[PDB]
Scaffold this active site. Structure first.
Site, PDB file in Angstrom:
ATOM      1  N   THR A 262       0.341  -9.145  -7.976  1.00 14.40           N
ATOM      2  CA  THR A 262       0.674  -8.992  -6.581  1.00 14.40           C
ATOM      3  C   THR A 262      -0.344  -9.562  -5.660  1.00 14.40           C
ATOM      4  O   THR A 262       0.030 -10.020  -4.540  1.00 14.40           O
ATOM      5  CB  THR A 262       0.924  -7.494  -6.217  1.00 14.40           C
ATOM      6  OG1 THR A 262      -0.134  -6.726  -6.776  1.00 14.40           O
ATOM      7  CG2 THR A 262       2.320  -7.023  -6.765  1.00 14.40           C
ATOM      8  N   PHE A 387       2.160  -1.007   0.222  1.00 13.23           N
ATOM      9  CA  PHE A 387       1.423  -0.350  -0.880  1.00 13.23           C
ATOM     10  C   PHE A 387       2.112   0.939  -1.255  1.00 13.23           C
ATOM     11  O   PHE A 387       1.467   1.827  -1.862  1.00 13.23           O
ATOM     12  CB  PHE A 387       0.005  -0.147  -0.473  1.00 13.23           C
ATOM     13  CG  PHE A 387      -0.748  -1.499  -0.334  1.00 13.23           C
ATOM     14  CD1 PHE A 387      -1.148  -2.242  -1.430  1.00 13.23           C
ATOM     15  CD2 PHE A 387      -1.114  -1.992   0.923  1.00 13.23           C
ATOM     16  CE1 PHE A 387      -1.796  -3.418  -1.361  1.00 13.23           C
ATOM     17  CE2 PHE A 387      -1.780  -3.241   1.051  1.00 13.23           C
ATOM     18  CZ  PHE A 387      -2.147  -3.890  -0.131  1.00 13.23           C
ATOM     19  N   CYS A 394      -0.239   2.732  -3.934  1.00 14.95           N
ATOM     20  CA  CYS A 394      -1.112   1.864  -4.682  1.00 14.95           C
ATOM     21  C   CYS A 394      -2.532   2.386  -4.720  1.00 14.95           C
ATOM     22  O   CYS A 394      -3.233   2.546  -3.732  1.00 14.95           O
ATOM     23  CB  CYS A 394      -1.127   0.462  -4.072  1.00 14.95           C
ATOM     24  SG  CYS A 394      -2.113  -0.713  -4.937  1.00 14.95           S
TER      25      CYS A 394
HETATM   26  C1  HEM Z   1      -1.398  -7.056  -2.553  1.00 17.09           C
HETATM   27  C2  HEM Z   1      -1.518  -6.436  -3.720  1.00 17.09           C
HETATM   28  C3  HEM Z   1      -0.745  -5.229  -4.140  1.00 17.09           C
HETATM   29  C4  HEM Z   1       0.404  -4.735  -3.707  1.00 17.09           C
HETATM   30  C5  HEM Z   1       1.369  -5.286  -2.614  1.00 17.09           C
HETATM   31  C6  HEM Z   1       0.669  -3.521  -4.476  1.00 17.09           C
HETATM   32  C7  HEM Z   1       1.760  -2.676  -4.318  1.00 17.09           C
HETATM   33  C8  HEM Z   1       2.001  -1.477  -4.960  1.00 17.09           C
HETATM   34  C9  HEM Z   1       3.080  -0.580  -4.706  1.00 17.09           C
HETATM   35  C10 HEM Z   1       4.258  -0.840  -3.743  1.00 17.09           C
HETATM   36  C11 HEM Z   1       2.894   0.507  -5.578  1.00 17.09           C
HETATM   37  C12 HEM Z   1       3.889   1.660  -5.675  1.00 17.09           C
HETATM   38  C13 HEM Z   1       4.939   1.483  -6.721  1.00 17.09           C
HETATM   39  C14 HEM Z   1       6.026   2.539  -6.855  1.00 17.09           C
HETATM   40  O1  HEM Z   1       6.124   3.379  -5.973  1.00 17.09           O
HETATM   41  O2  HEM Z   1       6.765   2.388  -7.849  1.00 17.09           O
HETATM   42  C15 HEM Z   1       1.669   0.282  -6.299  1.00 17.09           C
HETATM   43  C16 HEM Z   1       1.187   1.126  -7.259  1.00 17.09           C
HETATM   44  C17 HEM Z   1       0.133   0.876  -8.054  1.00 17.09           C
HETATM   45  N1  HEM Z   1      -0.748  -0.215  -7.952  1.00 17.09           N
HETATM   46 FE1  HEM Z   1      -0.665  -1.647  -6.543  1.00 17.09          FE
HETATM   47  N2  HEM Z   1      -0.361  -3.310  -5.366  1.00 17.09           N
HETATM   48  C18 HEM Z   1      -1.310  -4.321  -5.183  1.00 17.09           C
HETATM   49  C19 HEM Z   1      -2.520  -4.464  -5.850  1.00 17.09           C
HETATM   50  C20 HEM Z   1      -2.974  -3.626  -6.882  1.00 17.09           C
HETATM   51  C21 HEM Z   1      -4.240  -3.768  -7.514  1.00 17.09           C
HETATM   52  C22 HEM Z   1      -5.285  -4.799  -7.154  1.00 17.09           C
HETATM   53  C23 HEM Z   1      -4.324  -2.769  -8.456  1.00 17.09           C
HETATM   54  C24 HEM Z   1      -5.441  -2.491  -9.422  1.00 17.09           C
HETATM   55  C25 HEM Z   1      -6.730  -2.784  -9.288  1.00 17.09           C
HETATM   56  C26 HEM Z   1      -3.044  -2.072  -8.444  1.00 17.09           C
HETATM   57  C27 HEM Z   1      -2.730  -0.946  -9.217  1.00 17.09           C
HETATM   58  C28 HEM Z   1      -1.695  -0.115  -9.006  1.00 17.09           C
HETATM   59  C29 HEM Z   1      -1.430   1.118  -9.784  1.00 17.09           C
HETATM   60  C30 HEM Z   1      -2.205   1.522 -11.013  1.00 17.09           C
HETATM   61  C31 HEM Z   1      -0.349   1.776  -9.143  1.00 17.09           C
HETATM   62  C32 HEM Z   1       0.267   3.054  -9.560  1.00 17.09           C
HETATM   63  C33 HEM Z   1      -0.398   4.173  -8.748  1.00 17.09           C
HETATM   64  C34 HEM Z   1       0.063   5.593  -9.124  1.00 17.09           C
HETATM   65  O3  HEM Z   1       1.260   5.834  -9.091  1.00 17.09           O
HETATM   66  O4  HEM Z   1      -0.794   6.470  -9.394  1.00 17.09           O
HETATM   67  N3  HEM Z   1      -2.248  -2.532  -7.397  1.00 17.09           N
HETATM   68  N4  HEM Z   1       1.113  -0.929  -5.884  1.00 17.09           N
END
Ligand code: HEM
Length: 451
Positions: A262, A387, A394
């Site tokens: 992403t 996010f 996120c």
């Molecule tokens: C621009 C970059 C990013 C965007 C737009 C993004 C977006 C998202 C979104 C929308 C979710 C929620 C998903 C859901 O509700 O099903 C999420 C969850 C998550 N993201 Fe990101 N993400 C980004 C970068 C990252 C990065 C850099 C990491 C790790 C270093 C990461 C790790 C995670 C994890 C592990 C979750 C799950 C969190 C939980 O439910 O406890 N993401 N992200």
């Protein structure tokens, strides 16, 4: 109110509408036709797609709705297990891993990652400085080299060495091909014509499991205080327990993938919008020059790049790179005063549609205007959700933004950019979105880069 619904295909109901390589873009078009909510039926299932701030605000009430695993996340769960992204909120391993890994995304943590981010950013700049006259850049390809390397090094002290490769790293090739095989398989018969697909699948799962093995073994063989340190050693304050070995393996794979794809898309779309909007480019470039006064950026200087941050938020407005998230009703409830839901009913939030709600943003929603983000309290609650939501938001948000701000700031400091092909946006959908085939030319400003 009776809910709108798109066109049907007999017993398959709406399912064939998703028989496309661009389903999110198809759903957006349906949303434009049908409005803020529509029902989508397939054999055995139903979901309701939401597009307005007014409905999405209610779906984001964690007393009423929880994170659901969509069909896509169920499929990914065969690979990512009960890691953070693919766990249910009510599984013990969700809150345990959340509590153990949250500190890895603190301010003190980001300060600690900064040096290694600069390592990879300096490799990207040197790549482009070294191109010959009139050579071009393959933007999403280079952004993915950068963001994969960054999560590998910062998180795991592992060098993907993506800038030493003309092809994708074998881990990514094997992940994509294992995901494809898993998907093609359902739709097929033990025909020995598929013995070769099965052999390839085992080899790809082995590539993945060998990398995970190696990340862990190299660390045990080695003082680091990074994401992997907390995975291996950290204890949940609530239970007092550390992560189990199986869960650690699922976290490593989850972070290696989630922690780069992403962010590569965000950097790609940011550069796209900048070359298509030369006055915005000029403002961002000016800020980079004024702020980034040293040979390499400091943490404090990255924090000072307010306009670059606005550019990134505006790119996430238009093309949020994880464009949908799913929820379910925790109990029977009525959405928006009009739509009764039963316990368990699924909702999907179409983030790109939310981010085009004219009632929130005004009529000019297709225009790229970073200035929307200049007075942040002016953005209504639940209006901007790239996010995600609530406790299931996120965890990597600050890491993505810090990396992207740093990197885009350095790009703008060191190069002038040309959209030499007058590129036509073509958005490829995987687990993420990217501008496929986006290319630029970058003419060096000849500004020295520190070590
Ligand atoms: C621009 C970059 C990013 C965007 C737009 C993004 C977006 C998202 C979104 C929308 C979710 C929620 C998903 C859901 O509700 O099903 C999420 C969850 C998550 N993201 Fe990101 N993400 C980004 C970068 C990252 C990065 C850099 C990491 C790790 C270093 C990461 C790790 C995670 C994890 C592990 C979750 C799950 C969190 C939980 O439910 O406890 N993401 N992200």
């Amino acid at each position: 109110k009776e809910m709108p619904q798109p066109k049907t295909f007999g017993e398959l109901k709406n399912l064939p509408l998703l028989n496309t390589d661009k389903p999110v873009q198809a759903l957006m078009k349906i949303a434009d036709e049908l409005g803020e909510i529509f029902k989508f039926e397939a054999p055995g299932r139903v979901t309701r797609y939401l597009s307005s701030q007014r409905l999405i605000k209610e779906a984001c009430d964690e007393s009423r709705f929880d994170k659901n695993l969509s069909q896509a996340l169920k499929f990914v769960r065969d690979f990512f297990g009960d890691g953070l992204f693919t766990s249910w909120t009510h599984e013990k391993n969700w809150k345990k891993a959340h509590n153990i890994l949250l500190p890895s995304f603190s301010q003190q943590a980001m300060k600690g990652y900064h040096a290694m981010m600069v390592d990879i950013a300096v490799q990207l700049v040197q790549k482009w400085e070294r191109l010959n006259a009139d050579e071009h850049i393959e933007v999403p390809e280079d952004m993915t080299r950068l963001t994969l390397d960054t999560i590998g090094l910062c998180g795991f002290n592992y060098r993907f060495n993506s800038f030493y490769r003309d092809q994708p790293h074998p881990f990514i090739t094997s992940m994509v091909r294992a995901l494809d095989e898993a998907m093609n398989k359902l739709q097929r018969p033990d025909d020995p014509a598929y013995d070769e697909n099965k052999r390839q699948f085992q080899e790809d799962i082995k590539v993945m499991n060998d990398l995970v093995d190696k990340i862990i073994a190299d660390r045990k063989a080695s003082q680091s205080d990074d994401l992997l340190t907390h995975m291996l050693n950290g204890k949940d304050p609530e239970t007092g327990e550390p992560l189990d070995d199986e869960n650690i393996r699922y976290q490593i794979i989850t972070f290696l993938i989630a922690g780069h794809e992403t962010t590569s898309g965000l950097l790609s779309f940011a550069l796209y919008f900048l070359v298509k909007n030369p006055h915005v480019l000029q403002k961002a470039a000016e800020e980079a020059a004024r702020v980034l006064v040293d040979p390499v950026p400091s943490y404090k200087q990255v924090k000072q790049l307010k306009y670059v941050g606005m550019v990134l938020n505006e790119a996430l407005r238009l093309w949020p790179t994880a464009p949908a998230f799913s929820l379910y009703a925790k109990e029977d409830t009525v959405l928006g005063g009009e739509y009764p839901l039963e316990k368990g009913d699924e909702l999907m939030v179409l983030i790109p549609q939310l981010h085009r709600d004219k009632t929130i943003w005004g009529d000019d929603v297709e225009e790229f205007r970073p200035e929307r983000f200049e007075n942040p309290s002016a953005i209504p609650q639940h209006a901007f959700k790239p996010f995600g939501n609530g406790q299931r938001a996120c965890i990597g948000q600050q890491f993505a933004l810090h990396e992207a701000t740093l990197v885009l700031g350095m790009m703008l400091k060191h190069f002038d950019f040309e959209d030499h092909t007058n590129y036509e946006l073509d958005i490829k959908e995987t687990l993420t979105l990217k501008p496929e085939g986006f290319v630029v030319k970058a003419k060096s400003k000849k500004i020295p880069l520190g070590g």
